[PDB]
């Protein structure tokens, strides 16, 4: 059943697939991460507790003192979020950490304590996250973007033969720790295995094996399999495993137990192996030539002489065989090498290895890591131990250990964070196996190999860096301090931690200025995933494979919403239902299929898990008890989709929109438009500017409510009740009795944001959407924010659109707009600009804010007050003075004759220069707020005192009003309790409220409730007192301005900007355009009823662009309007409620097998009338992303509205009254204003400032600079014969000083002649070349 709030305006849904899983809170990825960072963890696995346990306890060098950690606490912020934004400070909480310093006795045992001290050390500020997932760092609101980075672990990759001739596939293994040095193994084209650390100089791999105290014999035993030979009389025998003969050419006869069978030159067939196995042939007899050439496994020493006959890894030869035979080596061991399955790589690497002992290997790696210095045994050992085997400098995280064990098929998923010898051995073995032919290379772009690192993790890392710096300082001070005459606070300096955290939150690449055009921009910025950042990739070095869409992105990363330009594919958007695993991997939900029945049970699967199962598509039909209607169901399985039986299906998609992101989900008829235009539309929705009045989209997707509510732009009721007070700035709700806590006033107050500046200089304004006495439930939208209409996202306006060419004004994506659009202010938007005037201390005098501006007429001064600051509400235009400021000119000493001349000239004989703040040229607006910031110690001006008094009065009024409302609620509670027992209603009305509080009661628990509420009333009074005092002292206190700044005056200008040619408008289907003409109403095409069209769009864009979704919308919107029209007329005729109810019910039931099922028979007559009034303009329609309205349904809805089924009507030209020869598609499309306004783009310059060194015009509109005539433009002029134009652009208009002065003078004199000279940049070049010791000169001057 629909709620009271929802019954206001029910959007007709056309979806058919039942919704099993509700859309998750769209900002969970940020809030959950930061909550893990800050919240207490008794197990010490997450966040600050984990970092503290990682660093503490701290002990001195062999000392008898220790510093240990007890608990941490985040204090209350000094300023709230709004105060931080106003004052330009960070919204942070102080971190209080309880620490204990313990000093032991010098006598043994070491644990004999002798004194203990405890105190709460303060160790910096932690920026807290706002309720909407943002950070306020310097008043600016910022978002920390999540990072998609390579997971820690081990990855096996190949070059695909690109690096060498003939395409020999070279294989590499790479170990990526969370923190520490990298370790790579790689194969050379000669099959030799090499190792590198931190991608430094290549070294033989066995060196590391030798550095781990493994001898050559031990290395060979680890990596190879051994073959045994015996020598008896003149016979040589080999111990044979038959499988080893596979693939070997039978170059000699083989005999065993008096049986011989060999075809010389043939390969040992599988039949031969089976015959050998069944005959149990354990030994064979082989010639000397066969055993010659094998590699010796272990060193053999002549026991008689002690001389090493043959070392390990040596190749056997006939003479060596004779020597070992005559020595008496009856048993010989060699290593087995097959050119296909068991390569000799380790042995060959040992041959190439230039080391021979552990010390030699350590020296080699020490020289590689620290070149240019002599080695040392202790230093080499320390370096090798610290590289991979020290927790202090190497950390292969828990996720890293899990991935490392999974890649090596180890059972355990938990283990030590540092590498063991077995780990390195196993990685090398796996690489050798991949080289041999068993196993496959890893897919780097696989989402099971990429990992999500969010705000909390990065903040914890930076806090840990700061804390290890603090730990080093603490160890130093503890070792070299007066142990008993101090306290723990004396040992900890908070500067490193604060510095690290502040640097992360201010300067990090992932700490981004929040884009705040509209709520969708905020949501999509907070759900953004970046492959860049620290520990990530770089734009110019990332290849196409990283950017490309991967099959594992299904349900996790949107394939459409990536931006264009250099960031394509590197910036992704989290899908609607996608969340993050415990280990940081993206998961998507699926419905379990049990015995052919789809179950409501939901399992979140990762990419690796998803690959194993067979997953049905969301559009597969199933009815009644869930069963696939079709025997064959489409599924994707291991990245290769096909049809499967019902029984083979393991999971099904939870929703038809789980692949797209939020922005792509908001696009209607996405399945009918190309991915390019869908991408463009999703990107352009984020650039829409809120308009003067919000307008719901007639054709929506049903996601508007979620985007508007999850984004905190709307005031959402946290408890149900009845609204007690409404105005433009405040909503006061009386909470329901069954919903308020004991001892509570039972009243909620919501304060609305009115006309504040967004990050993009747009307007943030909240407007009530409720009226007095209206019921309110939990979750109801109480006030609409920017781009929100009744809790639905409203990015643009519904516009009547005709698709026809119109006299070339739609020639190339251009848009022709009716003047009725401008008259109705439908795309008018409010822009707020903050302009700051800064008074600074300067040499020879400070700058003064005053109205006595020299050489300025009284007319310009009239707009200012007595303090020199413009009045609030003043309408101002370009060039007018907002804040009057003056600056000492310097001495500027004048001779008495010069002084007399200046006096004769006028008021020029002044030592003061104008530096006042003026409105930027072209900006015309109104002054809506003035804020004065004054350094402590500087006297406040009259305007500052007036603003301070106004703020104090406002604070007192607001606190008093809140106290009065809370007291009213508390006394209402008093009255209710007294009515519930011991009622004296007439006497109670006679008695005053203080007497009510003083009244007694019967001996019941209601007396206890009365006592609790009286105590709460006293607490309210005391809280009012303390809050008043605190707010007064905060208003009075000075501002921590930048050094050298005396006072800052900030003026806020509101500008309402009307739609004009040059402005960019777009729909949601990639259909961009720039307005070309604002056409008079009587010139627009009109229908038989005389209704003109609002916008004319060119039909030619649709076929080439293939964004057919805009056509369908244009049809459906027309139907959406038509129904509304039939309601509107029915409302104008004052028809009975019955007919209205029947028509609206028919409209809601029109769909074919729709899941909505609205039933108006349960609505009251007043509710039906309210709904119809809300439906008067149009019937809002929800068409989900891939489960939208079919074409036949659109035709039927048009038929209900008495509109043509084809969607085309006969139009007449208003200029002539003549019918257009063909019917024209006229409907309604949702259009946006894309923040690319022409008045921000137009710029012109004749002469201005020039750069200091290049002596060329400045760049940029803000600097009033000139356009760049680049090298391609010079080429264009050279292709013509335009030598004089090119010369004047190179010489006079850019760099020649005398040339430009003379050209200006000649143009004023009417002579258009040029006197070119040498460009100054060439002189700069000559001087720079001469500064390099190169004599460059001009000849024959």
């Amino acid at each position: 059943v629909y709620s009271y709030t929802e019954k206001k305006r029910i959007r007709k849904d056309f979806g058919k697939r039942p919704q099993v899983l509700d859309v998750p809170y769209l900002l969970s990825i940020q809030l959950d991460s930061f909550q893990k960072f800050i919240e207490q963890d008794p197990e010490g696995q997450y966040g600050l507790e984990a970092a503290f346990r990682s660093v503490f306890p701290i002990q001195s060098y062999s000392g008898n003192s220790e510093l240990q950690y007890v608990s941490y606490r985040l204090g209350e912020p000094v300023f709230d979020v709004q105060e931080c934004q106003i004052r330009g400070v960070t919204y942070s909480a102080p971190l209080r950490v309880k620490l204990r310093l313990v000093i032991y006795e010098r006598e043994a045992p070491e644990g004999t304590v002798k004194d203990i001290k405890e105190q709460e050390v303060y160790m910096g500020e932690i920026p807290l996250m706002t309720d909407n997932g943002t950070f306020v760092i310097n008043g600016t609101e910022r978002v920390i973007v999540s990072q998609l980075h390579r997971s820690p672990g081990v990855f096996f990759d190949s070059d695909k033969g690109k690096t060498h001739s003939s395409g020999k596939v070279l294989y590499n293994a790479r170990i990526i720790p969370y923190r520490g040095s990298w370790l790579d193994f790689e194969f050379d084209p000669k099959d030799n295995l090499f190792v590198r650390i931190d991608r430094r100089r290549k070294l033989p791999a066995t060196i590391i094996l030798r550095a781990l105290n493994y001898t050559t014999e031990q290395i060979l035993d680890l990596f190879f399999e051994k073959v045994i030979f015996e020598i008896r009389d003149n016979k040589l025998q080999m111990e044979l495993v038959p499988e080893r003969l596979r693939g070997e050419t039978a170059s000699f006869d083989i005999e065993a137990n008096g049986k011989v069978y060999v075809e010389k030159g043939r390969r040992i067939t599988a039949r031969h192996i089976r015959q050998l196995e069944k005959d149990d042939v354990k030994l064979i007899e082989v010639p000397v030539e066969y055993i010659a050439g094998k590699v010796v496994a272990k060193d053999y020493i002549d026991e008689s002489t002690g001389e090493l006959i043959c070392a390990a890894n040596m190749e056997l030869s006939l003479d060596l065989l004779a020597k070992l035979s005559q020595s008496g080596h009856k048993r010989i061991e060699t290593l087995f090498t097959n050119d296909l399955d068991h390569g000799p790589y380790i042995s060959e690497t040992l041959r190439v290895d230039p080391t021979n002992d552990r010390l030699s290997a350590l020296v080699e790696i020490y020289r590689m890591m620290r070149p240019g210095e002599p080695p040392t045994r202790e230093a080499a050992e320390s370096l090798f131990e610290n590289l991979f085997f020290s927790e202090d400098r190497y950390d292969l995280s828990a996720v890293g250990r899990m991935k490392f064990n999974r890649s090596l098929l180890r059972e355990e998923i938990e283990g030590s964070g540092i590498l063991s010898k077995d780990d390195i051995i196993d990685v090398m073995k796996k690489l050798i196996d991949i080289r041999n032919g068993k196993g496959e290379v890893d897919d780097i772009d696989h989402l099971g190999n990429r990992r999500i690192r969010s705000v909390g993790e990065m903040a914890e890392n930076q806090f840990r860096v700061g804390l290890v710096r603090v730990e080093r300082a603490v160890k130093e001070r503890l070792s070299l301090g007066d142990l008993d005459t101090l306290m723990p606070q004396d040992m900890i300096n908070a500067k490193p931690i604060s510095a690290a955290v502040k640097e992360f939150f201010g300067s990090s690449q992932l700490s981004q200025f929040m884009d705040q055009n509209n709520p969708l921009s905020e949501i999509t910025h907070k759900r953004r995933i970046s492959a860049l950042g620290p520990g990530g990739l770089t734009r110019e070095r990332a290849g196409f494979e990283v950017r490309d869409v991967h099959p594992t992105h299904y349900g996790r990363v949107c394939p459409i919403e990536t931006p264009e330009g250099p960031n394509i594919g590197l910036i992704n958007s989290l899908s609607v239902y996608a969340q993050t695993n415990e280990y940081g991997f993206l998961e998507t939900p699926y419905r379990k299929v049990t015995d052919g029945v789809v179950t409501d049970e939901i399992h979140y699967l990762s990419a690796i898990e998803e690959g194993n199962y067979v997953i049905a598509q969301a559009n597969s039909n199933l009815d009644e008890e869930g069963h696939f209607v079709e025997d064959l169901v489409t599924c994707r399985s291991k990245g290769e989709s096909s049809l499967f039986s019902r029984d083979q299906v393991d999971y099904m998609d939870v929703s038809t929109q789980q692949v797209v992101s939020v922005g792509a989900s908001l696009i209607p008829f996405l399945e009918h438009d190309d991915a390019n235009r869908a991408l463009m539309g999703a990107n352009m929705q984020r650039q829409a500017v809120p308009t003067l009045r919000a307008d719901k989209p007639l054709v929506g997707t049903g996601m508007e409510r979620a985007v508007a509510v999850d984004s905190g732009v709307t005031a959402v009721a946290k408890r149900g009740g009845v609204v007690q007070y409404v105005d433009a700035s405040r909503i006061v709700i009386k909470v329901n009795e069954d919903e308020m806590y004991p001892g509570e006033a039972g009243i909620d107050i919501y304060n609305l944001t009115k006309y504040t500046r967004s990050n993009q200089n747009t307007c943030i304004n909240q407007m009530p959407c409720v009226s007095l006495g209206e019921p309110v439930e939990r979750g109801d939208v109480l006030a609409d924010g920017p781009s929100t209409d009744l809790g639905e996202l409203a990015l643009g306006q519904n516009m009547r659109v005709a698709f026809m060419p119109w006299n070339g004004y739609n020639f190339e994506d251009s848009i022709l707009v009716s003047e009725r659009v401008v008259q109705e202010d439908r795309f008018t938007t409010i822009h707020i600009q903050e302009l700051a005037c800064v008074s600074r201390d300067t040499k020879l005098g400070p700058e003064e804010i005053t109205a006595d501006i020299p050489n300025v007429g009284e007319a310009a001064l009239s707009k200012l007050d007595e303090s020199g600051i413009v009045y609030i509400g003043a309408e101002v235009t370009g060039g007018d003075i907002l804040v009057g400021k003056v600056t000492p000119k310097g001495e500027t000493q004048l001779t008495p004759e010069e002084k007399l001349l200046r006096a004769i000239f006028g008021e020029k004989a002044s030592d003061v220069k104008d530096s006042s703040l003026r409105v930027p040229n072209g900006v015309s607006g109104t002054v809506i707020d003035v804020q004065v910031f004054t350094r402590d110690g500087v006297e406040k001006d009259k305007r500052a005192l007036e603003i301070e008094e106004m703020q104090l009065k406002q604070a007192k009024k607001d606190l008093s009003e809140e106290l009065q409302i809370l007291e009213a609620g508390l006394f209402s509670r008093i009255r209710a309790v007294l009515v519930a027992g011991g009622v004296e209603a007439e006497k109670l009305d006679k008695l005053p409220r203080d007497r009510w509080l003083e009244l007694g009661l019967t001996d019941e628990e209601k007396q206890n409730q009365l006592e609790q509420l009286a105590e709460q009333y006293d607490e309210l009074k005391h809280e009012f007192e303390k809050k008043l005092e605190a707010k007064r002292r905060k208003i009075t206190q000075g501002d921590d301005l930048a050094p050298g700044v005396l006072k800052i005056v900030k003026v806020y200008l509101a500008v309402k900007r009307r739609i004009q040619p040059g402005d960019k408008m777009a729909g949601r289907h990639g259909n961009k355009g720039v307005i070309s003409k604002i056409n008079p109403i009587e010139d627009m095409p009109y229908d038989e009823n005389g209704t003109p069209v609002d916008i004319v769009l060119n039909p030619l864009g649709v076929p080439s662009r293939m964004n057919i979704g805009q056509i369908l919308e244009t049809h459906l919107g027309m139907a959406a309007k038509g129904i509304g029209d039939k309601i509107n007329a029915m409302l104008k005729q004052q028809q009975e409620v019955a007919k209205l109810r029947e028509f609206i019910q028919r409209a809601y039931d029109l769909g074919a097998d729709v899941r909505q099922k609205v039933d108006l028979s349960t609505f009251s007559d007043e509710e039906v009338m309210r709904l119809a009034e809300n439906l008067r303009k149009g019937m809002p329609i929800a068409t989900p992303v891939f489960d939208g309205a079919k074409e036949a349904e659109i035709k039927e809805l048009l038929k209900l509205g008495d509109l043509p089924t084809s969607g085309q009507i006969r139009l007449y030209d208003g200029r002539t009254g003549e019918q257009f020869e063909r019917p024209v598609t006229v409907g309604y499309m949702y259009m946006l204003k894309l923040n690319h306004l022409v008045d921000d783009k137009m710029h012109a310059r004749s002469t201005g400032s020039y750069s200091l060194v290049t002596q060329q015009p400045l760049g940029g509109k803000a600097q009033f600079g000139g356009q760049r005539f680049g090298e391609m433009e010079v080429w264009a002029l050279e292709a013509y014969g335009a030598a004089y134009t090119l010369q004047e652009m190179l010489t006079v208009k850019s760099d020649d000083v005398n040339g430009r002065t003379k050209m200006y003078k000649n143009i004023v004199d009417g002579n258009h002649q040029m006197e070119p000279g040498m460009p100054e940049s060439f002189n700069v070049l000559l001087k720079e070349i001469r500064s390099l010791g190169i004599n460059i000169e001009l000849e024959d001057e």
Binding site: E1320, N1323, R1330, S1331
Partner: protein, 51 residues
Amino acid sequence: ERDGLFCARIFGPVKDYECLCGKYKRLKHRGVICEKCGVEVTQTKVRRERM
């Protein structure tokens, strides 16, 4: 500074036709090298040329 990277008597005056110490401050003293500080009276553009 007296002999630094921005020295006036090596590279030229900071302000046009004005000596560093201010003894000479007009075009009538053009070309005069001040005895007190050794800065030639000329245009500031020489600081753009003189190495």
